Design a protein around this ligand. Structure first.
Ligand SMILES: [Ca+2]
Ligand SMILES: [Ca+2]
Ligand SMILES: [Ca+2]
Ligand SMILES: [Ca+2]
Lengths: 714, 341, 341
């Protein structure tokens, strides 16, 4: 006998203690002209979808450190309205250069942050506040600071001075702060269909609904970008008849949760309390929830956390259902193997071929970044990537073979061509192979029917930041300048590829987490994004012992290898990032959308057994043999990525009349193509760590362009 | 019945890079790579010679009977010759031979200002020069050039199919004839049989009289074949592709339709009783008259009637059409783009 | 119905070589290699400890709750631990775990005088130590050991098949159950279903009462199954082999034949009315009495009559046989040699 909140609650009291009766259609809950708000970017066709350029952001990560954001709006939905802030104006410029979508890390009702202001303390506030809220701090190695008139932020910078692998004092205090902070990613669902209240100015009542909507209007109208909501239907924060956060398991016990076949214990494969999307009423809950975010919140797309735990049939059912409210809605998620195939056909990368549901591709990710997740110790240095200089510029610990390096080129190329199962290419050995025939750790590399089913990335909230990975993987020889270009080169593989471009907020500012792997509860300190551009937050302390202690020896070996970026380097990287996105939006040839278009137009050079390492050369046809003239200005495209310390030569386009992109020519000395030579005789000289978009201008009519080998079909 | 398939061989990577004051020519041996057996490249030689045009050679043999210029080495893909040079600038005259017989029809002229690397590749009877062994191999094992000639309803002329065990006419109405993910030629085909050039044909096409003649089956539906793509394929006894080429069909178009077509009137023939629109398009899949206003807005779109004897398309409309603008909306396979335009 | 097949994975090659005053133990992860997905080896730890017998360890954690001894690295094949040593001589005590739970049933004792290289490999629940990851992998993906127990007509006890999606009883009359050139288990089988150990069984075999019970199909021809080889197979939902083991059949032999067999007389029973030869051989494919002279020359070879209820074979001859020498000529599958002897 207990009182439970509604699983279908649409409004709540502070800390979700009581559900509230609400009418989301009320003008009172709408910012002015909400009813006439439209999606700034189209999502109707595969070609519309392929244009998608995602920036995965977090509410605190955006405004927690930005001083130009009024104090009371920092770490709030309303922060996006601070038109005159470093953060808002930064997003405004990124949007203008080609970032199309904003992905929001958990903004539904999370369980893991106390919504009562006075039961919480952040680093911005005095150390005394920390001790008042946190009992543990009063009985720890920092108890002495409760007496000091200094803030937690202050004390943290003081601890840096003597922070080392043998004395990890910065992270020790942070661990304690993290229990009473306002910082969590939020992958802990309390209520699926209510916004989080801690990101609101007042969490008591409906205030959150108008504020969230206000943020949506700002993103779409004032920043001119679509919205993607990160969703977590795979688990609930808790189950059982006692947990405060158990809602679903208190109402229909043993129904909503996935239980072990023998013991009836709630399974925890996802972490936490495994939900059962395979059961009819929970599948209904998921669909009804998405309906609300779709029409009442005007969300453009959804990213499903651990989507492999859901039955493919459920995802498709929800999708058809949501399409009736918004026909141009996009669904994508993490389609990794969940090990639920004994129970149902899982919503995996493989199983979703041709469904329309997109999945994150780990193939290009791992090839460009180097190694894979779960890498620990010296493997974090040993497993270099195309972008860390695997093969071309090895580090002292590296032992990667020529074939091993060539195979990463094979996986990267396949990814750049939208990771398709049927795309034919010339492998590391000179064999003609379908994408599905190229291995990826025992799995078929290519798996998709259309590039719109693939999301390429080299950085995300989870795992090491791109910069941190380069810091672990780059040769002692790679100076700050080459490592900045290494970041850009890594990003070019995503930005200039047929698949959907996704990236972590901050990659344009060489974002660092000072080697933190799982920054979910590493607070404002480690997850800091400086929008005033003074630094990338690198070397700000040893990361969490619990999860990164096993990597301290590797961190010390690499940490001091190169200088920390400053205003100049961050500005250099932003310029490069804006270049790449501008390029992506510069031709319909970059975003073909249809798998058949990719196969009829996309091909690669510098392929085979004899290939030059680090040189990625992609050709896109707009010539007569491809079909219709897609770009009225071009006949074809060339993407050249020289991820090598030696400058390279391109004699492939013998006598072809090419020109560097106007986008890159305008950039000049600040271009990634700075120094690219195009000889009258069609020979291209590519400088080290450079990216060039060579374009084939169209004459007075569609000529023959860059026709594909047409070596195989199907 | 044998399936035509690609050879299970990786794409080649030069094997030899041309160094200072010396060029390298690769012979991409098709017969050599289709064979799991080793080849004797002794018979292979280059007749090299200096002239007013291409004089960059160093010590070229004068004697035409001199077969001494044998390969400077070999591998699976074929032989190669490391040719010594006088100057790294200019060009050289190469005649690729197997004894005292030209392998490449045309006299090659290797312009070093066209191939910066001086590492070049050639295929027998190809006339073309490639910068790579790969570029050559791809060309060799692809539908390439338009070597075959459908000269009459029954006859297909092709020197490439001469003495070959498998000679076929592959076709596809709405797609290109190609090799699948397994490297097989699955598209519909017709079996060709060796024949002799007709007296009537020799008259019409004296420039092809020497070309190898092939008889098409009697069941062949000439009309529907000309509706789309046709490709001439030559293969081994085992079905490994030797050659795949596009087909030149003007000869058959004259032989199948011209007699009837010649007896008709063309254009937008406005006479008493209205206006007859007639266009000859014997290969077109569809033809429509599109009628436009003075503002060039569509006033009518009329699908035309095809006369099978002639391949002419017609459409009759009122005398009201006097002064109307029009164009024919075509649906036709173009061999240059290999698509149904 | 799913085909049981081998995993498409090359045989491993150690990845890490043990150096001076340090040993290396490889965990060959079966679940890890059957999966095209990456694995989290955090939960994996070794409880290492020094005792009067195996004291060569350097600084072993005392705390049993200490899961801190996590892998020193990993790859596709599984994790590994680089264990620091005190002396390169002697032995070490390793308890391989996934949390505070033993992965290998027996406490391992790694004798460095048995494995010269100090690079050793182990599989979960295997108890055995391999010199190579290869030797382990081969053992893992093979018919290995005799883990399964056919205890009665209907019941097969096997801990290895516990919670596994595919549990089968493969059989072959005249050959060994194996994987073909494609790595598939093509031999005839029976589908096993999870059941509980019978009260009657628990009495008979208390030492197996904890073992996972499986019900055989009702159509199962027990008699003909015991004529040759049987192998218990456990596979993934997709059919990738987890385990293949030989079957111990004494239990079923007692349950199927002993009641009848117990009521008969054995030997060369010479009585009034002649001599009855009887041998119990319920698995034998064939039994013959071979009768010998005093010089040990064959005087007669008589194929015996099998009683199906008992599995006993008999043959009746004259009282003339008093004093004759004899042996039984057997045709029988021996599980030690895996052949029909
Ligand atoms: Ca909350
Ligand atoms: Ca927290
Ligand atoms: Ca399960
Ligand atoms: Ca064009």
């Amino acid at each position: 006998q207990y009182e439970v909140t509604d699983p279908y609650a649409h409004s709540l009291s502070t800390n979700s203690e009581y559900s509230q009766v609400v009418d989301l259609n009320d003008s009172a809950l709408k910012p002015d002209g909400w009813d006439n708000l439209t999606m700034p970017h189209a999502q109707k066709t595969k070609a519309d979808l392929a244009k998608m350029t995602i920036h995965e952001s977090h509410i605190r990560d955006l405004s927690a450190w930005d001083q130009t954001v009024p104090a009371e709006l920092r770490g709030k939905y309303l922060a996006l309205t601070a038109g005159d802030s470093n953060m808002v104006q930064h997003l405004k410029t990124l949007s203008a250069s080609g970032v199309t979508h904003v992905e929001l890390l958990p903004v539904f009702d999370l369980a893991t942050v106390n919504e009562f202001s006075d039961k919480v303390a952040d680093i911005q506030q005095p150390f005394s506040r920390l001790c008042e809220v946190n009992s543990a701090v009063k009985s720890s190695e920092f108890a002495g600071y409760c007496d000091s008139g200094s803030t937690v932020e202050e004390v943290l910078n003081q601890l840096k001075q003597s922070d080392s692998q043998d004395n990890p004092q910065v992270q020790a205090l942070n661990t304690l702060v993290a229990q009473t902070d306002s910082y969590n990613w939020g992958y802990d669902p309390f209520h699926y269909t209510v916004p989080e209240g801690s990101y609101a100015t007042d969490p008591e009542g409906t205030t959150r609904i108008k504020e969230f909507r206000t943020m949506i209007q700002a993103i779409k109208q004032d920043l001119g970008m679509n919205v993607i909501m990160d969703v977590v239907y795979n688990h609930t924060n808790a189950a059982g008849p006692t947990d405060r956060t158990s809602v679903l398991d208190k109402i229909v016990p043993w129904y909503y949760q996935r239980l072990n076949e023998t013991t009836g214990s709630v399974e925890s494969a996802t972490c936490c309390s495994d939900s059962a999307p395979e059961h009819r009423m929970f599948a209904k809950l998921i669909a009804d929830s998405l309906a609300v975010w779709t029409t009442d919140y005007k969300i453009d797309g959804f990213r499903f956390d651990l989507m492999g735990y859901h039955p493919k049939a459920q995802i498709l059912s929800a999708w058809e259902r949501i399409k009736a409210l918004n026909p141009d809605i996009y669904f994508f998620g993490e389609g990794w193997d969940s090990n639920q195939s004994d129970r149902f056909e899982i919503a995996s990368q493989i199983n979703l071929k041709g469904t329309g549901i997109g999945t994150f591709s780990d193939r290009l990710r791992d090839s460009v970044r180097g190694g894979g997740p779960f890498d620990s110790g010296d493997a974090l240095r040993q497993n270099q990537g195309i972008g860390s200089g695997a093969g071309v510029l090895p580090n002292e610990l590296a032992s990667l073979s020529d074939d091993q390096v060539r195979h990463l080129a094979d996986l990267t190329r396949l990814g750049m061509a939208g990771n398709l199962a049927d795309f034919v290419m010339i492998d590391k050995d000179g064999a003609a192979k379908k994408g599905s025939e190229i291995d990826y750790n025992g799995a078929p590399g290519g798996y998709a029917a259309d590039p719109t089913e693939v999301v390429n990335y080299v950085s995300k909230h989870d795992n090491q930041t791109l910069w941190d990975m380069i810091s672990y993987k780059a040769s002692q020889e790679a100076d700050l300048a080459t490592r900045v270009r290494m970041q850009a080169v890594s990003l070019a593989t995503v930005m200039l590829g047929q698949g959907i471009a996704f990236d972590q907020q901050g990659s344009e500012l060489l974002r660092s987490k000072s080697f933190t792997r799982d920054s979910y509860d590493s607070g404002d300190w480690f997850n800091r994004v400086d929008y005033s551009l003074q630094d990338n937050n690198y070397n700000v302390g040893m990361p969490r012992i619990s999860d990164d202690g096993s990597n301290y020896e590797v961190i010390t070996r690499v940490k001091e290898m190169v200088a920390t970026p400053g205003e100049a380097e961050l500005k250099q990287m932003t310029a490069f990032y804006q270049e790449l996105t501008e390029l992506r939006k510069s031709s319909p040839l970059f975003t073909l959308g249809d798998g058949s278009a990719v196969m009829k137009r996309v091909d690669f050079r510098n392929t085979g057994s004899d290939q030059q390492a680090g040189l990625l050369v992609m050709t896109v046809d707009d010539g007569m043999k491809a079909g219709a003239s897609l770009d009225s200005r071009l006949d074809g495209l060339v993407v050249a990525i020289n991820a090598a310390p030696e400058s390279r030569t391109l004699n492939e386009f013998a006598g072809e009349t090419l020109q560097l992109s106007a986008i890159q020519q305008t950039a000049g000395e600040n271009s990634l193509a700075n120094g690219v030579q195009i000889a009258a005789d069609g020979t291209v000289t590519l400088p080290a760590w450079s990216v060039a978009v060579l374009e084939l201008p169209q004459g007075e009519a569609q000529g023959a362009g860059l026709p594909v080998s047409s070596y195989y079909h199907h | 019945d044998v399936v035509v398939r690609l050879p299970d061989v990786a794409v080649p990577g030069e094997a030899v890079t041309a160094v200072e004051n010396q060029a390298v020519i690769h012979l991409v041996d098709i017969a050599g790579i289709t064979s799991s057996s080793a080849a004797d490249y002794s018979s292979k030689n280059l007749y090299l010679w200096n002239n007013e045009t291409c004089d960059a050679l160093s010590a070229p043999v004068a004697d035409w009977n001199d077969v001494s210029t044998t390969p400077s080495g070999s591998d699976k893909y074929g032989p190669y010759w490391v040719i010594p040079l006088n100057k790294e600038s200019g060009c050289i005259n190469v005649i690729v031979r197997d004894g005292t017989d030209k392998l490449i029809d045309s006299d090659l002229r290797v312009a070093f200002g066209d191939f910066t690397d001086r590492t070049v590749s050639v295929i027998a009877g190809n006339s073309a020069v490639y910068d790579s062994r790969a570029d050559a191999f791809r060309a060799a094992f692809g539908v390439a050039l338009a070597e075959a000639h459908w000269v009459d309803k029954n006859t297909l002329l092709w020197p490439g199919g001469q003495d070959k065990p498998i000679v076929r006419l592959y076709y596809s109405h709405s797609s290109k004839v190609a090799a699948d993910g397994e490297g097989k030629f699955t598209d519909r085909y017709l079996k060709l049989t060796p024949t002799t050039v007709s007296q009537q044909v020799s008259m019409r096409f004296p420039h092809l009289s020497s070309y190898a003649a092939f008889k098409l089956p009697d069941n062949a539906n000439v009309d529907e074949l000309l509706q789309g793509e046709t490709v001439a394929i030559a293969a081994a006894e085992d079905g490994i592709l030797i050659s795949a080429t596009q087909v030149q069909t003007a000869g058959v178009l004259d032989d199948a339709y011209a007699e009837a077509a010649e007896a008709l009137s063309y254009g937008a023939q406005l006479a008493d009783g209205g206006v007859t629109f007639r266009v000859w398009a014997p290969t077109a899949q569809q033809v429509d008259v599109v009628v436009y206003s003075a503002d060039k807005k569509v006033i009518g779109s009329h699908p035309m009637t095809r006369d099978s004897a002639s391949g002419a398309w017609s459409w009759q409309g009122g005398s009201d059409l006097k002064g109307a603008f029009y164009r024919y909306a075509m649906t036709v396979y173009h061999p240059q783009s290999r698509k149904v335009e």
